Amino acid sequence: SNQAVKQRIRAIKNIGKITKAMKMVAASKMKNAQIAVEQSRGLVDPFVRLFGDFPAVNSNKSVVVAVTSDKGLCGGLNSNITKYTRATLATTESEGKDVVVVSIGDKGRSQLTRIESQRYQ
Amino acid sequence: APSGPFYRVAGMSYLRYSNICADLLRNVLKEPFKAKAQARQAIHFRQAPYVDGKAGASKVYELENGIPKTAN
Amino acid sequence: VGLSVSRVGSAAQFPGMKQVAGTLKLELAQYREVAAFAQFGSDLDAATQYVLERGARLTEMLKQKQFAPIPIERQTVAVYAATKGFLDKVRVQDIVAAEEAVISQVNPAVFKILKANGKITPALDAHLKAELRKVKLPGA
Amino acid sequence: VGLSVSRVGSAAQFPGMKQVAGTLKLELAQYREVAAFAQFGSDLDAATQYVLERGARLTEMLKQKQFAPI
Amino acid sequence: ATDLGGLQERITTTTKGSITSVQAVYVPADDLTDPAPATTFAHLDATTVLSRSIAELGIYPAVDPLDSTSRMLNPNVIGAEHYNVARGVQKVLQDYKNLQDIIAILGMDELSEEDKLTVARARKIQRFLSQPFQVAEVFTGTPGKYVDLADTISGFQGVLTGKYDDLPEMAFYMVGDIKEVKEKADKMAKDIASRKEADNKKVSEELK
Amino acid sequence: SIAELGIYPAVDPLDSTSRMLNPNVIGAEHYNVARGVQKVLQDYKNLQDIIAILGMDELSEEDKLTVARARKIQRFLSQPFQVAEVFTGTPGKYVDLADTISGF
Amino acid sequence: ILGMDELSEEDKLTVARARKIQRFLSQPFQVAEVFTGTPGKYVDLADTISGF
Amino acid sequence: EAAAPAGPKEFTEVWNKKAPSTLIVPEFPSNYTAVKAVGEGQVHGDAFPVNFYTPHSILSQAQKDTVVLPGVDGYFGVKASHVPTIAQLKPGVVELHSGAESEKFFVSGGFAFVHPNGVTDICVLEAATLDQVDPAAVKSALAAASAAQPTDEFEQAANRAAIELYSALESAVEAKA
Amino acid sequence: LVPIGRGQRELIIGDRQTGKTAVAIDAIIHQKNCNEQVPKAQRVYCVYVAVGQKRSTVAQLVKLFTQTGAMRYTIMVSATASDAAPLQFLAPYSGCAMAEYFRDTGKHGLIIYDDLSKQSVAYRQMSLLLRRPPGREAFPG
Amino acid sequence: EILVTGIKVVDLLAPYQRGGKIGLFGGAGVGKTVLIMELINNVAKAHGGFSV
């Protein structure tokens, strides 16, 4: 009776040690991987300067990729672009065209094969 | 079958050609600088063809020596 | 270590321990706050991994077998051999030789001078640091 | 099932049931040992998922009505 | 137990008359294991355990659906269709209770897509068990709703099968029937369109 | 909780103590394999807190090895009993002392 | 977890303020001057308020 | 004909119909690029902005007055307002000039644009400065390259690329000024 | 999963309204199905001891037993909630003595002490009022 | 026999018997007088007998 609340306190106390360690693990990773993202932002600039940026084009075939995460403690990231996938997928496909849906990251292969399974290759 | 440059008529895409030339530049660097070469050369991912919407397939790559210069 | 108190404190301890164990309990206290990071794979700010490997070799400095108490001058040297950075930074497969190798290879005069003065003088830690670097352990 | 024990075990049940309830008793324990890892849902190497569809089909087997003994 | 049992055994239906008794039982410091509520539980055919934590959500009547029981909830007494949607409503409310601390310490982002449907449905039926009373209309302002029995069984089939996954959660809050959640889901979207409705100006009234 | 994993005899390997667990009595190789087993079993008890939050996939193979070894040790402490064959079916086994020190 | 460098301008003026508020909360005591050398200070309330 | 005008601010109209209003409009990569090509400027004299890029490193975004690029039809210099050019580059030495100073990166290939507003972009995959290459490995690699000739055409495409890159690198280290 | 034996004491324990009586009722109902089938001496004579229950619950349970036919083999001892505390205390022993007639004559009995948690409260009332000193939760020693 | 009360959580999950004992368990301020007044409002007018 009184020990069940005592060792449940032991459960939540070191979960507060796990998720405080995990937050600094993700903060160190975000710090060193921030400079790699600043570098790769340069090379995408000459191509939209040259080829433009035409999202609302009429195609017969289109490959949509959804770049999700792999481990899933990210909390509202991989679900948010699967909302933004179908918000972008359905607004561009009304011509009766073919669509291949790809996902990078296996949190999408758990999330997109049930909302778009017919077009997931 | 096709036409174009020498890589394109050999079935080699441009991204594989320009990566084969890319790591071949990285192989001849100085050893303080060649240490930073196989970091950005290693390919570590896996793929799975979803032919059905039901299950996957295979094909996993653990290449730390760059893009495959062999046929594909 | 975090729950054990002494209300008399350092005022009734060995002066050769008081200057060495003052940093021992601080670096053990830093090790308790970073104690959840020990179970991780994704390293942190090598300012915390500096705590984590030094702290986890400081706890092994306080292990002791039963019915064999240690004289005080042999404890203050073996804690000097871990708080001053003479730690087993060698790959720690070789624990059985190098754990006791400090008090057995360092010459017994430094225990007589530390016991009689009760303090690591400036004329003695220069020979303690001289004696600590010539630890042989040649079977390993 | 994890808390209900019986001191007799064998020799006090039906011999026909003893052949088929033995592979029910541990196979429900394989269902419970992995149900505390059903929040991540990565269900690796098709083993911790295979016992989920068979462990859920054994607990629904034991459900029965009231005042209708079998 | 024999003082309470001496009193409670006199309140019965006999062969020459029935007493439908409704007793309120106070649990002394919200302790249901207190010996005076625990003794009373064995003397009743239908217990309606009210919860202090359900009422803090604002759900009224604050009935715990997973602590209230009845001897009438039996398929040979109330029919198998009323019984099956009661046990399905209690199934998804227990499954939402099993997720209550994962949703606390990890949020709803890490649940499955088949359990986020469990959470969203059970968050709907625990608003749909809420109801305004004709005696609470004085201090709440909202008029009371009497719901018939068949409108409850058909209304709770619909939130279980998935017929009302379109509607928001708060459309189910404090309405009578499953008709009234549809007529409140419209009014919640007439109201967000009514910010763009008109610019109210009171003109020329100082001399009328 | 040992018994609810199906491990029998349901002996807590940590909470059990003896006066004979002493290297001056049972020898220093019986002793260190007893303390080595309790070390890896206590290490597994301290890792199961973070395995249920993470999944035992990022432990970088020094704590994936101490989980894989301790999980073998929990099963290898179980044993069929001769008096328990009449309700579990498998015949009981007598293990000698040198055959469990070298096995562990 | 991030660093002192990326702190905002209105978030590192307070850090430079709170660091010297908490230094000015310390005080030498007259009863401790017999073994610490520095003499002690009796600070009036009028000098405490304006000083903070 | 230009009867179908797609675009980022035109994507919003179809997206306010089929996609819900619960989601704000998704971003586009043009919303992060300040510099374009068709809107003139950026020259104002004899300097012009040069953007030298690998996927992992921004090597320059300064303004130069001469850029010497190794095109597939030979080396060519780019002065202040060059003709708009999409020039495919072969393995060779990209040479940046701001004045009397010169930095010589040896690139592995990858295109180079000159734009109608005078901005230029060099888009390579690996750009090594010549003091990061040791020439002892280069001649032992071309000798390993121009010797083994497999009859598979995917390898002789890779062999021609190895021949063309290592030869231009050998002449890049012997052509010291 | 939990197979019972013929002379075995098996506890049915749980919270209120978890189906404890239902498991024991399904035991008594099932014996009537088996007693019309076995040769005359593997028959099981059930005894239901209803301690501390309300009297309408017991009548709701006799009605289930006479319409099943299980009341041909069943005795029902019922010291209900209105009875005195020494009657609820003594009703498990009264019902066991009725069930021991079948044990002591070569037949097989099955006794259900429904609410044995309510016998101990009735015995606590007697012992506290005989001024025997109380113990854990004021129970007798 | 059932006694319908017009209350959704009562009619569905724990229906009331027409001649049975009914308990409303509550903890000081949770609403077991408002519920028992609503039962007076709902079932006592529709009843043909006498209330006490």
Ligand SMILES: Nc1ncnc2c1ncn2[C@@H]1O[C@H](COP(=O)(O)OP(=O)(O)OP(=O)(O)O)[C@@H](O)[C@H]1O
């Ligand atoms: N197998 C079953 N299937 C469906 N309903 C059941 C089952 N078993 C029990 N119930 C229902 O659960 C309710 C509680 O059962 P029961 O009265 O047997 O439990 P109890 O713990 O003896 O109750 P109390 O605490 O009032 O004595 C009953 O209304 C019964 O109809």
Ligand SMILES: Nc1ncnc2c1ncn2[C@@H]1O[C@H](COP(=O)(O)OP(=O)(O)O)[C@@H](O)[C@H]1O
């Ligand atoms: N059905 C309801 N609707 C709205 N408010 C309610 C309802 N039931 C209870 N309340 C609120 O809870 C309080 C408790 O009411 P009451 O039943 O008088 O207390 P108790 O249950 O302690 O006897 C009331 O003051 C009222 O504000």
Ligand SMILES: [Mg+2]
């Ligand atoms: Mg009962």
Ligand SMILES: [Mg+2]
């Ligand atoms: Mg009241």
